[PDB]
Symmetry: D2
Subunit: 295 residues, 4 copies
């Protein structure tokens, strides 16, 4: 129950004002909107939330703003991971005290720890707040290192490590994890275009970007699937597929911020070193969004 | 009706006697076994049947023997592809007179034709026998070239091109094809571990290796899925996954031929330049099969 | 001495008439031109020679045409390899009798033999004509399988296996081969842009495509290097680099045939399934060639 | 003069005491050793120096200690990069007051900025300390993003950007940069196994790990090459290759720290989340070093 975050977890964007500061009021308005339109749980200051370029102070305040906003309607997972174990632990402890319902812990990027060091890293974070759920996040494309299924299988023996956001794109790996972990341990898709395929082999849901725009449709797809209406589910997947691709034509969260802007949200641009969507990206998104009546 | 091959297509091995010659008696006997145990359609002399090392006369003879062995009970698709278009055409013409129900046409290997060349290749084969169904076969890991979804989409406009055996591992690509092709055009998994995830996005089934051993459980998984018993399907998938992986621990069809031998089938070795399963491999296989009660 | 093929080995193109037949007279005129402009040895019916789409009869006749043309000025290596061991042996034997000075033996494409089977394949071909030099050809991008350094090191123990055309793009691998093979065993670059870097770690030269156009400059680069004029060599490399890339903007030998056509050679187009250079490719080549005063 | 760092830049390890704290005494002693044995310039707190897990105060302290230790004898380049541009700028400003001779600026890891974002990132760092040389560092395997040669070429137009540490393994990319940048802009190998091949196409030298152990032999190889003793250079390269590979058998700097320990240096372990060299690894190292007479 403490580990149940639903099926649609949205990695929320971080809106910025024109001066580049965090726009707390927009973040609140976005959080409430999401939670009323398909998001079960908000993942705050993930990758999509531009974590690398935020200060800790801005992260802390975002977690507080969202918790206040979505009190008793949605859970809140805090992006607290790092390629330094000590920094992750520090962040996790601070987030624990303000009331987050879990943390998202990325595999250490850039330094490429071996599996033994990855095991210790996640173990140490788990043990620093043994009652706080911990969601592993494997994204080799960004970190330069994959978390092996054997390592995940071992970490799932720690009671508060309650799942993995699997964004490797490798279904073999996801199935190896699923078949050797308990049911309290959940797999989430980390790519919107893989949600349906991963559901088919036992995943719980998705940590989504697209849910900012079509969260009610993702719910419908997942509920359709779980109730055995497999062709309704596939129809929705195939209909959304062009949007899912458009949302990664350049590095997330550049496209999603442009999409939201096209619907009138004042989310600002991304923060350096991320750069603004070029005209191409914007036009491709527009056409796809128009085709889906999102604008 | 004509492009309907069912859901389990088995890429049958080619058994050899101790002297290396084709064992037509075991071929027949294996074909009859398969078709009584889960296989809807037999794909003869594909990659799994060691097409590259067979003579054209051996392939012709196999087509005749299998077709006659299973006529009335199942269809036969003949592997007739090549990286020479003239050769593929000539093989396809001859298959058609034998009376087979379709051909499997690999993307040209080794020479890496551009998409325009691949389009013209397939079109010319389709046009040489305009009433014989033609199944595309995309396996970039072996050919060194990927068939693009735009190209597949254009090809599906040709009446007798009725599907693709998709062995790229790329589920976005498959989805792209599925959403832009008509329902007469079917997608088949080219990898047994991808059958369930591809089914979830609209694939028809699998061109399988594992069905030599667990055809009935594959039928059960696919039938469970289509009727909405999604957890029954994922249980089967997860239970079989170690077998699926073990069948690719070295290059197919080395493992599957060793798995068959463990069960008592006299299939012989593979032919040079494929070498025999070393002892580690056979031990891995034996353990997984024992655990599944296959020996 | 029997194994010395020089430093520039040119994988000659195969010119076709308008009706698509082999243009023997152009092949002769091209062979003589090459041998007078930097080519030490002609590699006939390689990949660049469109081997996969030629008949054996056309190959045999090309080997004869070239041998007659370049008698006592250049050696001739015959492309005789296959993914069937028996077919390679047959081809090698036939080529041996008409006087070729060696064979180029590609790693079996598409069927992905394990290393043990690759060892036996090349061993068997070597032993079928034990006095005929044999050049291994590793091109994983096209074959789907890499020949391991350990396997190459073992094959170099067979007296007539006198080197490898290394087109994997992996310099570690090339250095591992160099350091554990005798000096009678030579490494050749299989990519024109890697010739200089591979020379630096002990390669002999290149099996070149670009030599059709700048063979005298490649000689100058290699002679410059071997005489210790390293900056002359690097200058030539850097000056040719754009041509080297242009020659692979689409699949070789499509660009090189267009380049030759732009210089007035009547080489025809490629044979299906290879398709003609599109306008883009042609314009890019033109600009690069003009910039180098090749037209 | 100002961008001239010589040819061997050593990415020095950061030694730790048994309690995990930085060992400044060993740092000094190692710095002095290196600079007497082949190292022209020391790169401090790069990837090899475990930058990710050090505090900013530890890095500041290292910069001061090494600079003072080797002042008059060698230059010091400070690792100051980040995937936040504001952080890189602040670290760069502070390095400049310490009196270091340049900064090493990694491409932003994890967040995958588009090229326009990478251009703006680097430009802003360069502009924050316009008189401090800035060395680009491209290592896509760790960052998940490649710095394109067009982008590098534009950046080399900025006065103080004086080179790139190229660890992509892509020799075409390096050549593209070399031919389109002025001679004040230098290319350094980011991989010890690529030093010789990159030198052959116009690189200046290497930012090295192996120089901790064979700095003088690296100097000999590079000096041999530039004076045209090309076979002396390739002999050294080939002799060292097993060492180069062994230093990357698990993630750098795990092996190199174990190699140093085998020689008697008290460098400690790596810091979490990097784990200790298992026994197989240390045995591999020991054998190669024994064979090279390094222990
Ligand atoms: Mn942050
Ligand atoms: Mn943070
Ligand atoms: Mn909405
Ligand atoms: Mn049936
Ligand atoms: Mn055949
Ligand atoms: Mn055939
Ligand atoms: Mn019969
Ligand atoms: Mn041929
Ligand atoms: Mn042939
Ligand atoms: Mn010429
Ligand atoms: Mn010096
Ligand atoms: Mn630090
Ligand atoms: Mn730092
Ligand atoms: Mn001191």
């Amino acid at each position: 129950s403490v580990g149940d975050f639903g099926t649609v977890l949205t990695a929320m964007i971080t809106p910025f004002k024109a001066d580049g500061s965090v726009n707390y009021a927009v973040a609140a308005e976005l959080a409430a909107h999401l939670v009323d339109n398909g998001t079960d749980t908000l993942v705050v200051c993930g990758t999509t939330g531009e974590s690398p370029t935020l200060s800790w102070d801005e992260e802390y305040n975002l977690f507080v703003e969202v918790l206040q906003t979505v009190a008793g309607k949605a859970k809140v997972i805090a992006g607290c991971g790092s390629n330094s174990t000590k920094e992750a632990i520090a962040a996790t402890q601070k987030a624990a005290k303000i009331g987050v319902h879990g943390t998202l812990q990325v595999v250490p990027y850039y330094n490429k720890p071996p599996q033994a060091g990855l095991y210790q890293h996640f173990q140490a974070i788990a043990q620093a707040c043994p009652d706080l759920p911990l969601l592993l996040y494997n994204v080799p494309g960004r970190t330069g290192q994959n978390l092996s299924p054997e390592t995940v299988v071992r970490l799932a023996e720690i009671d508060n490590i309650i799942g993995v956001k699997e964004a490797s794109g490798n279904l073999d790996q996801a199935g190896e994890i699923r078949r050797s972990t308990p049911k309290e341990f959940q797999i989430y898709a980390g790519d919107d275009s893989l949600t349906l395929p991963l559901l088919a082999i036992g995943a719980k849901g998705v940590v989504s970007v697209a849910s900012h725009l079509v969260g009610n449709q993702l719910q419908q797809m997942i509920q359709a699937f779980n109730s055995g209406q497999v062709t309704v589910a596939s129809d929705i997947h195939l209909r959304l597929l062009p949007l899912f691709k458009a949302l990664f034509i350049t590095t997330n969260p550049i496209p999603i911020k442009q999409a939201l802007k096209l619907q009138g949200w004042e989310v600002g641009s991304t923060r350096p070193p991320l750069s603004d969507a070029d005209a191409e990206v914007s036009q491709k998104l527009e056409a796809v969004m128009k085709h889906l009546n999102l604008i």
